[PDB]
Amino acid sequence: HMRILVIAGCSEGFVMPLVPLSWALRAAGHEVLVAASENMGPTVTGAGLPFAPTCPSLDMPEVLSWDREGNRTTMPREEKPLLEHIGRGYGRLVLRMRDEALALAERWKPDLVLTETYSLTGPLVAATLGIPWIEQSIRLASPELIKSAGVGELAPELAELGLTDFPDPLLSIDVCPPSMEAGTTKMRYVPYNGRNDQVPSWVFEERKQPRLCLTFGTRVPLLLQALSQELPKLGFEVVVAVSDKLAPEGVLAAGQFPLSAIMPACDVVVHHGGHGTTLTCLSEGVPQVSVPVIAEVWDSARLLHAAGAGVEVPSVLAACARIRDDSSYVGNARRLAAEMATLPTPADIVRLIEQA
Amino acid sequence: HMRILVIAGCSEGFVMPLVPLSWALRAAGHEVLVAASENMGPTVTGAGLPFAPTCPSLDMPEVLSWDREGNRTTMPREEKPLLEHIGRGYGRLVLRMRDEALALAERWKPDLVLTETYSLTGPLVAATLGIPWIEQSIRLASPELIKSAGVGELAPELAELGLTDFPDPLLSIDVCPPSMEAGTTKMRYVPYNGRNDQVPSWVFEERKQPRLCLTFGTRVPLLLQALSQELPKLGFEVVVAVSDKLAPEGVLAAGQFPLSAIMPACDVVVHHGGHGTTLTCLSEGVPQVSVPVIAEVWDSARLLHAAGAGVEVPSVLAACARIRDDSSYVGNARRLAAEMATLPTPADIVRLIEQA
Ligand SMILES: Cc1cn([C@H]2C[C@H](O)[C@@H](COP(=O)(O)OP(=O)(O)O)O2)c(=O)[nH]c1=O
Ligand SMILES: Cc1cn([C@H]2C[C@H](O)[C@@H](COP(=O)(O)OP(=O)(O)O)O2)c(=O)[nH]c1=O
Fold this sequence. Notes:
Rossmann fold, 2 domains, seven-stranded parallel β-sheet, binds thymidine-5'-diphosphate, SsfS6 (chains A, B), hexosyltransferase activity (chains A, B)
């Protein structure tokens, strides 16, 4: 019987993929508490998990566009220092969370910390209290250059603990299918995509024409209205998964739909290359048209395109018809979904955590 | 990899205790879908689970106060036929759910049905499709007289399938601690008590006086305001767990608080003998003052009072001071909580289900 403090990010993409393992721990009789930014409250509790805020409402651009000195930062065009730039963003994110995250850790007294790769507040809190921690990957590929830059940015905070680098996690979890990737344990990606009123009625009824899902995530929407009007002309019934506030002919519906709920009713997905969106579409064996927006998802879209599970489009109307006609995309997507199903479940991983 | 259709009731007390096992299944990589009345949507999805309505908004009194003939029914004062009366209520509840629950089962095609003891729509749907089903108990004691009456009321519906009684479930789950009770597998009761914005701040900070939790559930509130004003005079800081719409001196707070989140910050609980409330307080080793309102929870309050884990009050101010001064109540409550922790987890049960 353990008390596990789960430390998450400031947007849905950094919180949702930690939900299945958190519930897997709770299912094993353990006490779980998810600590994240105050704006991630409804997301955490909407997943049925206990929540505690570590900082006010916060989004990544606030932290990424300003450094410790207080000076505005800009993004390098060169991919490599762009990744280091992003990494330092995650590092400074820790400076906003650590205080309340530590004080919460002092009082709640956890035995173990669960967190994602770029949420470095986890390792910091774990190292501060002198307790082990678990690292779970939430990406097809996690560029270590991002992580290293974040650790380097936190150097004054580690020296405060008389450290150079965070102590290695008790378990490093990876979710990339072996037939894709270029001290880690593999885990099957069980997708959690948020909270809806109910599973849409059209999901259960029969489908008499190819259905396409169009989604850009929770950050990229703020092109979507253009692809919505044109894609049906390619011979598709389209559904747009987007925020209800953000939410038409040939379109079936437009609104907040957890992908895992609607994926069985779809044949192809056009998206922004989002980590959670990609892995979810992968796990359900659906060919994807990935339009990689954010730099940190670039590697994942490369692994995806290479395996032929989908088409990376750095035109997207052309990529769909290319999938609508060629069947090798569906085949690979299903092959990889089948491969992920063989991997250990979050339930299997809980035992490993308990056992060592 | 299975598709499990979870069939629940029409009020929170019949839905919430099915959440942990449902997530335990989802954690093991299985596909889960919770089917309940339309008013139980927010409860299901608030737990992070997929939802599908089997009937419009519905509460137990509608079904219990009217029979198949369409005639108004009254409650017997004699406990025994009162239990049979209640049982026939659950039986007629099936008549309201079975249609949409069946059609949903035809299209979604589940391999297995998960349900509670008195949700007979589960067994009916399972028997109709010819698939196994799982019975989980959500009570300290489940009077078989209730269940038998429900089955008897459904006799025309079983004869429709050429049956007399529902086929025995693949697994019958019980949650009563061995040192309490008078083809079942024991499972530890992992409490899920709903959805809140966050864990209250006072839960983590230190407590310099005995704190009491006052809650009557989701049905009984519609006395609570009286016990709220008087109980602090007994030397207590009181917190009232009740609907926010329903929600003062000596009172710390009043509103919707999932018990499992606030239980560590409490010393004693006064309640309506609610099944979920009792089991949750039990699992956290907290002495209870049970005021049994509903007839079906009477047996549970008897098992509770006998074990000395609390005081059954069929005056409640006296029962608290009796617990506030005598320490044998806390001892038994903790002994039973310790006993439940030894029992197999919902995660352990998932394996059993997978294995046989
Ligand atoms: C807007 C929206 C998001 N989602 C989910 C899918 C993913 O799990 C998550 C999006 O995360 P992600 O795919 O990483 O993209 P991003 O981080 O840029 O937002 O939210 C839906 O399921 N339906 C929707 O309508
Ligand atoms: C109103 C309320 C209910 N609950 C929970 C506790 C139980 O899990 C459930 C109540 O179910 P239960 O104890 O069976 O009582 P009833 O069926 O009469 O409603 O709801 C809270 O945790 N906090 C609250 O403020």
